[PDB]
Design an enzyme around this catalytic site. Structure first.
Site, PDB file in Angstrom:
ATOM      1  N   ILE A   1       0.956  -1.067  -0.027  1.00 43.70           N
ATOM      2  CA  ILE A   1      -0.222   0.602   0.168  1.00 43.70           C
ATOM      3  C   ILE A   1       0.888   0.762  -0.065  1.00 43.70           C
ATOM      4  O   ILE A   1       0.363   2.299  -0.588  1.00 43.70           O
ATOM      5  CB  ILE A   1      -1.040  -0.269   0.969  1.00 43.70           C
ATOM      6  CG1 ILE A   1      -1.776  -0.906   1.051  1.00 43.70           C
ATOM      7  CG2 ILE A   1      -1.714   1.603   1.312  1.00 43.70           C
ATOM      8  CD1 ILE A   1      -3.013  -1.602   2.168  1.00 43.70           C
TER       9      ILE A   1
ATOM     10  N   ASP B   1      -1.744  14.519  14.539  1.00 39.02           N
ATOM     11  CA  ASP B   1      -1.178  14.345  13.198  1.00 39.02           C
ATOM     12  C   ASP B   1      -2.270  13.955  12.417  1.00 39.02           C
ATOM     13  O   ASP B   1      -1.996  13.984  11.049  1.00 39.02           O
ATOM     14  CB  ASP B   1      -0.023  13.109  13.662  1.00 39.02           C
ATOM     15  CG  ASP B   1       0.593  13.303  12.149  1.00 39.02           C
ATOM     16  OD1 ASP B   1       0.746  11.863  11.962  1.00 39.02           O
ATOM     17  OD2 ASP B   1       1.145  14.106  11.609  1.00 39.02           O
TER      18      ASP B   1
END
Ligand SMILES: OCc1ccn(-c2ccc(Nc3cc4nc(OC5CCNCC5)ccc4cn3)c(F)c2)n1
Ligand SMILES: [Cl-]
Ligand SMILES: [Cl-]
Ligand SMILES: [Cl-]
Ligand SMILES: [Cl-]
Ligand SMILES: [Cl-]
Ligand SMILES: [Cl-]
Ligand SMILES: [Cl-]
Lengths: 148, 287
Positions: free
Chosen positions: B9, B122
């Site tokens: 991925i 984040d």
């Protein structure tokens, strides 16, 4: 409230828990923990010491549920204590990451990582609760003080 | 042994995989434990500890952790893409109802984290996972932390520059859940325009100028502690009169009101995830 006082209380707690360890000093756990914190600072992995009153309380919360009365050698105690300390740095430390080297005292690294995952499986709920619940923090802090 | 890799991925490194026993599709994050660059395992153990305690349909689900070879494998639910790829796939052009659905789900996931005493720290499009059925999940708790034990400071090196709030840019020692609500506002602006960062600064000085240039420079009345922050310096006084209409053309007055509540410079004035979910932008009666 002193870091020195609470570290003593932790040392005295470990000597009482680990009744098989006839030649363990209550200063030995303090020496092992201070040594790690000093090394990380001087090697520039952190800007300030991790060992504060709140983080000793957190470490003790782990130690009291993780460390068996039946620990068979001072080496085994150091290995399990440094596993709980590594998890304390990882969960509560101000730096993104900390290296393995200062926390590793076993030749079998696989056993260190298995112990990390075992402690997390047991303790992850209390690790969040001692942050989320100030009453629980105070209870643990009082218990550590009463270990002397 | 338990999982067959189907494809990478991205980058630990993440793989689409199949459970060899059940045949379910999952995402595997492999983390090397024999550190070349010391530190990686530390962040993975924190992420495991937090995600074990964060079970919500809008937070990426950690199913399992495996220890084999010299590696840790985090087994996650599989998602089709992230919001960065989604923007690239639709020319950065979202239908207003997809804008609303994506922010709604982000706030539900964020609201759940904050109610559990976890800061994400984040939030950015790469950390928002998107499924073809329109589900959104908050991912990557590698920089996340539990809060509640009083402490001198947290790290000021949190959030990538473009998503970092003005209090943190001025070097504030402590912050609350407010840190993630600013990032949520930055992402709302991307959803509601063309998927481009609202405040793409080159450094801390440029970042603060871009924020104050759009929103106005906070006054002593609006933010009395501002001048006392560790890395405070005087900025020009930009006016509070600059229109947001062309900066978020997908939003009506209701959407713009919610965006202004998320992008409050003074962290204490920033709307909470719980309050944001009660905003009329999300009512059944919204125009
Ligand atoms: O065509 C190029 C391209 C660009 C983007 N995609 C892409 C993005 C995501 C998924 N699916 C996925 C990703 C996951 N990531 C995880 O953790 C990471 C989160 C971000 N920071 C690093 C850690 C955790 C669980 C995940 C479950 N699903 C995908 F299939 C493709 N492909
Ligand atoms: Cl002995
Ligand atoms: Cl699975
Ligand atoms: Cl949906
Ligand atoms: Cl993740
Ligand atoms: Cl100013
Ligand atoms: Cl300047
Ligand atoms: Cl403002």
């Amino acid at each position: 409230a002193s870091t020195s006082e609470l570290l003593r209380c932790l040392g005295e707690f470990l000597c009482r828990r680990c009744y098989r360890l006839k030649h363990l000093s209550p200063t030995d756990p303090v020496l092992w923990l201070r040594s790690v914190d000093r090394s990380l600072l001087l090697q520039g992995w952190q800007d300030q010491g991790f060992i504060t009153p709140a983080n000793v309380v957190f470490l003790y919360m782990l130690c009291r549920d993780v460390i068996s009365s039946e620990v068979g050698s001072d080496h085994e105690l150091q290995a399990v204590l440094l596993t709980c300390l590594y998890l304390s740095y990882s969960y509560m430390g101000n730096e993104i990451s900390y290296p393995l080297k200062p926390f590793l005292v076993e030749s079998c690294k696989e056993a260190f990582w298995d112990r990390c995952l075992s402690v997390i499986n047991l303790m992850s709920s209390k690790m969040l609760q001692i942050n989320a619940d100030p009453h629980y923090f105070t209870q643990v802090f009082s218990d550590l003080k009463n270990e002397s | 042994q338990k999982y067959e890799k189907l494809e990478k991925i991205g980058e630990g490194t993440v793989f689409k995989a199949k459970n060899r026993e059940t045949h379910e599709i999952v995402a595997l994050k492999r983390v090397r434990l024999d550190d070349d660059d010391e530190g990686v395992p530390s962040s993975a153990l924190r992420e495991i500890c937090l995600l074990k305690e964060l079970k919500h349909k809008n937070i990426v689900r950690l199913h399992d952790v495996l220890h084999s070879d010299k590696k840790l494998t985090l087994v996650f639910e599989f998602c089709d893409q992230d919001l960065k790829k989604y923007f690239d796939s639709c020319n950065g052009d979202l239908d207003p109802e997809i804008v609303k659905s994506f922010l709604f789900q982000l706030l539900k996931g964020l609201g759940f984290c904050h109610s559990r005493n976890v800061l994400h720290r984040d939030l950015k499009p790469q950390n928002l996972l998107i499924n073809r059925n329109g589900e959104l999940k908050l991912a990557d708790f590698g920089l996340a932390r539990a809060f509640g034990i009083p402490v001198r400071c947290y790290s000021a090196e949190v959030v990538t520059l473009w998503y970092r709030p003005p209090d943190v840019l001025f070097g504030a020692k402590l912050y609350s859940t407010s840190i993630d609500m600013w990032s949520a506002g930055c992402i709302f602006a991307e959803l509601a325009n063309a998927g481009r960062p609202l405040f793409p600064g080159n450094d801390v000085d440029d970042q603060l100028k871009r924020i104050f240039r759009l929103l106005g420079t906070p006054t002593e009345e609006q933010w009395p502690s501002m001048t006392k922050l560790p890395d405070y310096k005087p900025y020009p006084m930009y006016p509070a009169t600059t229109s947001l209409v062309n900066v978020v053309p997908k939003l009506n007055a209701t959407g713009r009101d919610l965006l202004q509540n998320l992008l409050k410079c003074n962290p204490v004035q920033r709307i909470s995830a719980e309050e944001a979910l009660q905003h009329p932008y999300f009512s059944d009666f919204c125009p």
